Subunit: 296 residues, 2 copies
């Protein structure tokens, strides 16, 4: 069992390099528009307290060097759309896939196409944290996506590293996830928690894959489990979460509350130097939907 | 810090579905040739003791349904090339990237484009184990690759799951990694070991990323470390491995043998319930080259 991203081909065809001043970062070229973080116009000094409207007036179309692979695109318009820079180019992308802009939820996973060394360089899978951060030099940024049947659902664009090393960004409409702004100040993240629903989902995956030792013959309750969860900084389980785990519960023959009892035991008793799916930690970056999609 | 694969776009354009009988699996369409595991011609019963030459004579061109996305390719020839089925089609792939066939070495990493539910479905990074296995239902197989500048280096194609759940396959010439054959028999893997060089490389990455607690003020020697390594089923360190870690040693200011002393301590003393890069286990699936490529 492994953490796997969606194939990145369709997103690769949309990735461009946007340069303004000394700042070079990644953009998304869809039809005749390029999207990138608006702080591309900021010197690493404007970032302290940026008046973006003011800084943008100082910019013209020629302030922006947009490079699609090894073609320089001619920029014929610029505007601000929330925290995104909206760039109009003279050519519409012939590799534009069918796409939607979705705003994902805390606990939900997505694939990331990471820009390093001035181009699309790597791909990995991650989860939006309950505190709206991302655990994701020469970074030129990154695009988050899921592939929903025939369509690319763009959900994330990287903007900032916070002083703690955790990342913040926006959806593709330019609206930040969580309480964050694109300003180099003392923005503290909310206290993070483990995504319970995902941990249970991954436990089901372990059972599918042969790891059974953590199973016991006790059950629990939503009220009891959530006390334990509160203590261990886990997300509270709701009835919605239980209903979601239905298919996996049927597949394994282990009732969701029985699996919660196994988890409760694992939090209080540890793992005694054992492994679940080659892991000594409890993994929370697989949704039930990711588990279903892998087996099978 | 995260395990990331190469972007998969160039490999996605080469992936086809090859059907023979009830067996459907993934092929690689390059120019006018499709490559897939030869056991596509076997019923899950021929697999016990397959005479492949004999089974192939019974097949004709019409025995093979080759589907590129949603185009059925017409197969105009078939032959066997080691453990690969070599299929000749009437159309050469217009999405053929620049590519090489490389045979990688134990300890070396590669990206995998995994075929699930009858199409390219997922992407992840992995290492060839020292015992020539892969830690990688509805599996239709998978292609292993690195992207070496402008060129795709194909290094792996999945063939078999062994009775222990570990995977075996070939390079793209059809030659198995390790002592394995494409036959459903009692093939036991060699005893696996941890890739030392990669563990040191990842420790350097931890130091780059701020984790420093495991550093001490002792050094060790190749002869001393290798006794400890033997005991803990780690690969012996060679002078080649030390020279390879040079750039990372210079970057961090930590001499390779000093880092070995930190590792030696970690093997004998554990981690006392601490973490390195969010991990309580020692990670061996990043080469020095992967670490350099990420930071930066």
């Amino acid at each position: 069992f492994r953490k796997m991203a969606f194939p990145s081909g369709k997103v690769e065809g949309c990735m461009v390099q946007v340069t303004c001043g000394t700042t070079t970062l990644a953009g998304l070229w869809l039809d005749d528009t390029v999207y990138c973080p608006r702080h591309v116009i900021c010197t690493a000094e404007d970032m302290l307290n940026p008046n973006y409207e003011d800084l943008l007036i100082r910019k013209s179309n020629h302030s922006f060097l947009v490079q699609a692979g090894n073609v320089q695109l001619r920029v014929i318009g610029h505007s601000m759309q929330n925290c995104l820079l909206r760039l109009k180019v003279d050519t519409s992308n012939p590799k534009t896939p069918k796409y939607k802009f979705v705003r994902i939820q805390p606990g939900q996973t997505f694939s990331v196409l990471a820009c390093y060394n001035g181009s699309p360089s790597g791909v990995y899978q991650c989860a939006m944290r309950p505190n709206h951060t991302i655990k994701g030099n020469g970074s030129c940024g990154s695009v988050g996506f899921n592939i929903d049947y025939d369509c690319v659902s763009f959900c994330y664009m990287h903007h900032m590293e916070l002083p703690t090393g955790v990342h913040a960004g926006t959806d593709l409409e330019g609206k930040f996830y969580g309480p964050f702004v694109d300003r180099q100040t003392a923005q503290a993240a909310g206290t993070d928690t483990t995504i319970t629903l995902n941990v249970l989902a991954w436990l089901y995956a372990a059972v599918i894959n042969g790891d059974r030792w953590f199973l016991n013959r006790f059950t629990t309750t939503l009220n009891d489990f959530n006390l334990v969860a509160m203590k261990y900084n886990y997300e509270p389980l709701t009835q919605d979460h239980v209903d979601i785990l239905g298919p996996l519960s049927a597949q394994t023959g282990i009732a969701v509350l029985d699996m919660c009892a196994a988890l409760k035991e694992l939090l209080q008793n540890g793992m005694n130097g054992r492994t679940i799916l080659g892991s000594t930690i409890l993994e929370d970056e697989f949704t039930p939907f990711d588990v279903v999609r892998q087996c099978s």
